[PDB]
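Researcher: Let's walk through a ligand-bound prediction step by step. First, I give you the protein sequence. Second, the SMILES string for NDP. Third, you return the three-dimensional complex as structure tokens. Ready?
Model: Ready.
Researcher: Here are steps one and two:
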Amino acid sequence: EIDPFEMAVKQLERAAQYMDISEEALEWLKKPMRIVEVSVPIEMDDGSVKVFTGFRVQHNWARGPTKGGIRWHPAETLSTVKALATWMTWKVAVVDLPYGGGKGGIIVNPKELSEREQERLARAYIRAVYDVIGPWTDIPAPDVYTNPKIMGWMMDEYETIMRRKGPAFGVITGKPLSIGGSLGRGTATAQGAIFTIREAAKALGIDLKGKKIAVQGYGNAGYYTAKLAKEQLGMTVVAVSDSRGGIYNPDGLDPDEVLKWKREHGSVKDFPGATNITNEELLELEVDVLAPAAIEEVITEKNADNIKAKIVAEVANGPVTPEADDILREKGILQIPDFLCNAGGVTVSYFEWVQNINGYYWTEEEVREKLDKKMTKAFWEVYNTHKDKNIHMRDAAYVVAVSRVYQAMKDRGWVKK
Ligand SMILES: NC(=O)C1=CN([C@@H]2O[C@H](COP(=O)(O)OP(=O)(O)OC[C@H]3O[C@@H](n4cnc5c(N)ncnc54)[C@H](OP(=O)(O)O)[C@@H]3O)[C@@H](O)[C@H]2O)C=CC1
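Model: Step three, the predicted complex:
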């Protein structure tokens, strides 16, 4: 049923087919450099002891310490962790961070655990994987069903074990502001998406002031993308959507009022002055920027032709299928690859790690400007590769990331060819 690691390896081979890479380097990149599977025992609230399965996969560390989150899902598998670590490698390589690829996970349903049990689980996971993590070895991060509270617990346990012999704040990112946290973490993904959209408009020669944007999904990423677009880029937000449905208004939407209505009516539907539309119908609107910030695979071969957006900002994690990719490219529409558009979160986590390591913490403006520089440089590199190699933007981003990792490997002497 299309194993995640098989899919990742196929993606890597496809990317290697568009660039000059040696066979030994490809074989090295097809396998994670270190996989750690540990037992995570905790004491239940009823006094019993339960053992959970924890993972920590470090795909590659040629460019520096590995970076990646920890998932707490009942359906976690070592294959999924390996695939996500492989993808995290390219995610940190495309935006030029001194990081490798890493990922963790515990096979547990956190909906049935109390606060004390969750804290015990985090501390036991740290005790189990201490020997393969560190400020300069492996930096975990929040992921699905994991939050900054668990980050604080993990950091505290790591500091307790390490005996405060170094920057224990920098061992993990996504921490609360009170303990080594960073500013701008809430709006990192949306800010990166906005910078990439601005650069794409600059590349296409389109002035965004007075244009239209449609956003699918109105969670944290979608709402902040719409709000930041309207604020900075001056783009008129004409359509937003949630799981229940979507709304449309050619005169424009106010993101704050829409958020208030969603937080009051439980959904964005039936917003005053707005016409109710379906998600599929939102994908059909004639806009200049489309930002899918929702479930995977919303653009398929069926509806790829009927898309009228000039720029498709893949804020979510792969909302466009390869057939849809080819169809959309044929229509002369610029796509911003998913792991380049939403690279703001990992970039801001890197900024947090830098602040923790240095012992000096920045402000909201400094973080915003550094993120702006990083996203602009990454998008311009990807677009230049796209224009030079006459390939898809996703293929160009993969080529850039794999080339950076391959050059780092060659410089270390790991591969001689
Ligand atoms: N936000 C972040 O920090 C980062 C985000 N990403 C990626 O970004 C996207 C969104 O992130 P995030 O804000 O955390 O997500 P959220 O869980 O906070 O919100 C999800 C939003 O998308 C909607 N949604 C879920 N399924 C559908 C669907 N089938 N159709 C239409 N709308 C749907 C939800 O609707 P409803 O409210 O009704 O449930 C909600 O509006 C994801 O694809 C994620 O992978 C990854 C990098 C970090």
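Researcher: And what stands out?
Model: The two ends are 35 Å apart (CA to CA). The chain is about 45% helix and 15% strand.
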